[PDB]
Amino acid sequence: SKEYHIDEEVGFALPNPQENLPDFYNDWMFIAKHLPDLIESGQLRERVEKLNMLSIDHLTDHKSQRLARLVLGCITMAYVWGKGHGDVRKVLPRNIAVPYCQLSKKLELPPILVYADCVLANWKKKDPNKPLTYENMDVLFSFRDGDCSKGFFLVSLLVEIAAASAIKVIPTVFKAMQMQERDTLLKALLEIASCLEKALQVFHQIHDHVNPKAFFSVLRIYLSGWKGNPQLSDGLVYEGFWEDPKEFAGGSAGQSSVFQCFDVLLGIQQTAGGGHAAQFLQDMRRYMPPAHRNFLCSLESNPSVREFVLSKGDAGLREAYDACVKALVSLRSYHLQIVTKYILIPASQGGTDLMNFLKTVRSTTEKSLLKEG
Ligand code: HEM
Numbered sequence: 001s002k003e004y005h006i007d008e009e010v011g012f013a014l015p016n017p018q019e020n021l022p023d024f025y026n027d028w029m030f031i032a033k034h035l036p037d038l039i040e041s042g043q044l045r046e047r048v049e050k051l052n053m054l055s056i057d058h059l060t061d062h063k064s065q066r067l068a069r070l071v072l073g074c075i076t077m078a079y080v081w082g083k084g085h086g087d088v089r090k091v092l093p094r095n096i097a098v099p100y101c102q103l104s105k106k107l108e109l110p111p112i113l114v115y116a117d118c119v120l121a122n123w124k125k126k127d128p129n130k131p132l133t134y135e136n137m138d139v140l141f142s143f144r145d146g147d148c149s150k151g152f153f154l155v156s157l158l159v160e161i162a163a164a165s166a167i168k169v170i171p172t173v174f175k176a177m178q179m180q181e182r183d184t185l186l187k188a189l190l191e192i193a194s195c196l197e198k199a200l201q202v203f204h205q206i207h208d209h210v211n212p213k214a215f216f217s218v219l220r221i222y223l224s225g226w227k228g229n230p231q232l233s234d235g236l237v238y239e240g241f242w243e244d245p246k247e248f249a250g251g252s253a254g255q256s257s258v259f260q261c262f263d264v265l266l267g268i269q270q271t272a273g274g275g276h277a278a279q280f281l282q283d284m285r286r287y288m289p290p291a292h293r294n295f296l297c298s299l300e301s302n303p304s305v306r307e308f309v310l311s312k313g314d315a316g317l318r319e320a321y322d323a324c325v326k327a328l329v330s331l332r333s334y335h336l337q338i339v340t341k342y343i344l345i346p347a348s349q350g351g352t353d354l355m356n357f358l359k360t361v362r363s364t365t366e367k368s369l370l371k372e373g
């Protein structure tokens with residue numbers, strides 16, 4: 001894999017993300033680093049409004065630009081939603097909206113907190129010399145004390161990284177197919193299946209670091225966007241940058257290149273059809289870093305692994321292929337249980353479109369099994 005910005009040990013996540021910005025931006029950093037406090041004491045908005053319009057020209061490298069996206073994104077979420085009890089600002093102050101929009105066009109990402117920001121760039125290692133384990137990690141920014149942003153963002157990060165291990169065998173898969181190396185292809189498919197099965201284990205930690213009520217009533221609020229959102233009907237106005245208000249979806253793992261890439265690799269047509277689930281996943285690609293979305297479609301232009309495995313009358317291959325698919329539905333099935341516990345139940349103390357969306361995606365995955373009938 002070339003410079004698709006894919007690291008060998010971290011995958012789509014940003015390797016060792018930057019934690020500090022040039023002193024020239026101390027005003028931004030101070031607000032983002034103290035969000036839990038500023039929101040609760042109610043001085044967050046007045047503070048955002050007192051900011052001077054800072055130039056983004058002093059953000060030279062990619063990492064410092066990513067850190068800034070994270071900072072401005074977290075601040076924007078806090079500004080728009082406030083204490084997150086219903087009072088919402090419909091206009092983002094030009095002194096913040098402008099740098100954020102310019103920085104966004106530069107990185108080719110919408111001006112709203114995105115998965116690539118709050119997960120892929122929002123972490124650090126406590127001990128540089130220890131492994132990437134929950135116990136040795138922390139997020140750079142949270143919204144409110146007790147919002148469980150650490151558990152949510154990091155466990156997502158950890159799942160992403162476990163899945164990354166298979167991203168590196170993708171090349172082996174395509175080489176083996178054209179070189180007609182049957183044994184190599186089988187070994188590769190089984191390896192991918194193993195990595196996806198491990199990611200499922202990682203996913204288990206979500207119960208240990210995220211509490212249903214804090215997640216549902218707090219975190220969820222700050223990660224909402226303004227596209228098809230009732231309380232921000234026409235969207236948000238980025239004062240000084242855009243004439244009318246603009247609609248943008250909130251953070252979602254549907255913006256994760258990781259799960260989208262294996263569906264492509266395996267020939268599962270999540271994006272096909274005109275259905276709502278497909279439109280959503282197709283649209284989420286606009287929220288992924290440009291390098292990552294280029295990876296996704298470079299995968300789509302490679303010959304089909306599915307057709308190859310099918311055209312051969314090789315049970316070994318069919319089974320290795322199916323193990324990969326089976327691993328994806330297992331993950332999606334597990335994730336349904338999680339949505340039931342962290343969203344359905346807390347909301348019970350409409351939102352069925354949610355479960356149907358997830359099931360549609362899972363059913364499309366199951367349908368791809370070859371040897372099921
Ligand atoms: C508190 C736990 C979690 C909840 C409540 C949750 C909730 C949701 C919801 C509501 C959606 C639907 C679309 C949207 O609104 O963005 C969704 C989609 C998705 N989530 Fe989660 N999620 C959780 C944890 C995770 C974790 C740890 C991962 C792993 C990185 C993950 C991966 C995905 C993916 C890939 C999709 C898109 C559809 C698919 O490929 O099946 N989620 N999630």
Ligand SMILES: c1ccc(-c2cnc[nH]2)cc1
Pocket residue numbers: 115118119152153156223251252253254
């Ligand atoms: C950050 C981390 C994970 C998510 C998410 C999980 N499931 C759907 N979106 C959204 C933002």
